[PDB]
Structure 1
Amino acid sequence: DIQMTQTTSSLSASLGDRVTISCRASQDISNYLNWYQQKPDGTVKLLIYYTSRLHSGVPSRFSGSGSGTDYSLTISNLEQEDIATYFCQQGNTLPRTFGGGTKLEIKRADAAPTVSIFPPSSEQLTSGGASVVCFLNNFYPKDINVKWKIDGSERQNGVLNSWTDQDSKDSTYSMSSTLTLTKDEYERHNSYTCEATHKTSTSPIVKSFNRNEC
């Protein structure tokens, strides 16, 4: 049908800034675009309609333009409540399609994660399970790549990650990583490594332990 593309998943800015998210149509919408705002608590509102330009009860800082294939929402002066996810939507041709959405996020100095490893707990091992966990706390920006190593190599299976939204006091992200094995498998190997690669340096932050040394 009519694709809807927002080149940017996440957009950074500071309060007081003039923020512009963009949205591109696979074809000519002849000005039938609308803007939706979804706040973290999941609720969605209507900010603008009809090729942008049109409001609803929304504050003046909210502006909007475009035509044909390109269109964009501008928030002339960013305010805390404006931190949400914005989707665009072409109401020209059936079916009605949306845009991946552009989540804003506060700008913070680069930080670098605090990497921590943890061996399986006795209480778990006696169950016959064995999970090695790894926390990469309070880092920014939000892109980070973690890599597991069992006895100097491999390991992709059993690795389940979780990521937290941006913090509200400071604006850092955090990440949980768990590698699940079987007490037997776990016991067949010695060193386990959790390698955190972040743009904050070239050298991966490496934290690990050896069962033999426990």
Structure 2
Amino acid sequence: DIQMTQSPSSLSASVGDRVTITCQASQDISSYLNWYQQKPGKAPKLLIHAASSLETGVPSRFSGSGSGTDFSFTISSLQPEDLATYYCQQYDSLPLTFGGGTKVEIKRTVAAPSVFIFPPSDEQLKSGTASVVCLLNNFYPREAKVQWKVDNALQSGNSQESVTEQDSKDSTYSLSSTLTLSKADYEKHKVYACEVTHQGLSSPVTKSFNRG
């Protein structure tokens, strides 16, 4: 088939920066190339058709060019809402093939995570499990550490965390750590602590509560 080679695999640039992504077809595909934008968790959206025709409704900062084997896509000045994975697709023939994609990540200033800790719900305890939740809100970069301490003893392999994709409004992340103990182990202890270390934190922040 026609192989589509996209580059780079991912990249980070500041808002206002020009972004250029390229695609090459294994063979001359004339001008039959489309560019899609895939926001996190959404269906892909067409931005550019036939190598350079900008779809109506798409911001003018997007543009494509080239023909034959080499093609390129450009974002004049990167904005928070451009956070997505861009794909090029050749439509010279079936099977319509896509390139690997390119994750663009917005670089921005360091933001300190504002943190909260939430004790298990009595309704949750009734199921045989207690989940203590620790929330790290609006931070940058993503590299953040969250260590659990139950009665001063460090925890391991009983924590699970979900971090969000970079926010399209302010380019920050939010993370949620969850300590899961059986109702028995939970009742055996009093102090539940969550130690969050981040780059915008001079010293590790510790949130905690005393069991009822």
CA–CA separation in structure 2 for the residues paired with 1:191 and 1:111: 29
Cα distance change on mapping 1:89 and 1:120 into 2, 3 Å: same
CA deviation profile, 1:6-57 (whole Å, cap 9, x unmatched):
435464432xx243142466x745466431123568353322245x445444
1:83 maps to what in 2?
A: 82
The structural deviation recorded for 1:112 is: 0.9
SS of the residue aligned with 1:184? Answer: helix
1:152, 1:10 → 2: CA distance?
Answer: 40
Q: Cα gap change, 1:180/1:3 in structure 2, threshold over 3 Å: closer, same or farther?
A: farther
Counterparts of 1:45-64 in structure 2, within 5 Å, are 45-49=45-49, 52-57=51-56, 58=58, 60-64=60-64
Using the TM superposition, give the Cα deviation of residue 134 of structure 1 relative to its aligned residue in structure 2, in angstroms.
0.3
Q: Which moved more, 1:32-41 or 1:130-139?
A: 32-41
Letter in 2 for 1:19: R
The residue that corresponds to 1:166 in the other structure is 167
Q: TM-score, normalised by structure 2?
A: 0.69
Contact 2:110–2:140 (8 Å) recurs in 1: yes
Superposition map of 1:193-204 within 5 A: 193-201=193-201, 204=204
Q: 1:4 to 1:207 in 2, by over 3 A?
A: farther
Question: Where does structure 1 lack aligned partners over 5 or more consecutive residues?
Answer: none
Give the match for residue 187 of structure 1. 187
The letter of the residue matching 2:188 is R
From the superposition, tell whether residues 153 and 21 of structure 1 become closer, same or farther in structure 2 (CA, over 3 Å).
farther
Write out per-residue CA displacement over residues 46-83 of structure 1, whole angstroms, 9 at most, x where no aligned residue: 22245x44544455432234689875421224567x52
Amino acid at match of 2:185: E
**Aligned AA for 1:183?**
K
> Please, which runs of 5 or more residues in structure 2 have no aligned partner?
none
Tell me which moved more, 67-76 or 147-156: 67-76
Secondary structure of 1:186 counterpart = helix
| Contact kept in structure 2, 1:148 and 1:156, CA below 8 Å | no
Counting only pairs closer than 5 Å after superposition, residues 12-91 of structure 1 correspond to structure 2 as 12-14=13-15, 17-23=16-22, 28-30=26-28, 33-39=33-39, 42-49=42-49, 52-57=51-56, 58=58, 60-65=60-65, 71-78=71-78, 83-91=82-90
Verify the 8 A CA contact 2:193 2:207 in the aligned structure 1: yes
Cα distance in 1 between the residues matched to 2:136 and 2:77? 33
Hey, which of these two has a bigger chunk of strand by percent? 2
Report the residue type matching 2:87 in the other structure.
C
Deviation at 1:136, TM superposition (A): 0.4
Letter paired with 2:154: S
Q: In the alignment, residue 136 of structure 1 is paired with which amino acid?
A: L
Partner of 1:113: 113
Q: CA, structure 1 residues 69+144, in 2 after alignment: closer, same or farther (shift >3 Å)?
A: farther
Partner of 1:152: 153
**Aligned position for 2:103:** 102
> Would the aligned equivalents of 1:33 and 1:49 in 2 still touch at CA under 8 Å?
yes
Tell me what 2:208 maps to.
208
Structure 1 residue 161: Cα displacement: 2.3
Q: Percent identity at matched positions?
A: 47
Number of residue equivalences: 205
Contact 2:18 2:78 in 1 (8 A): yes
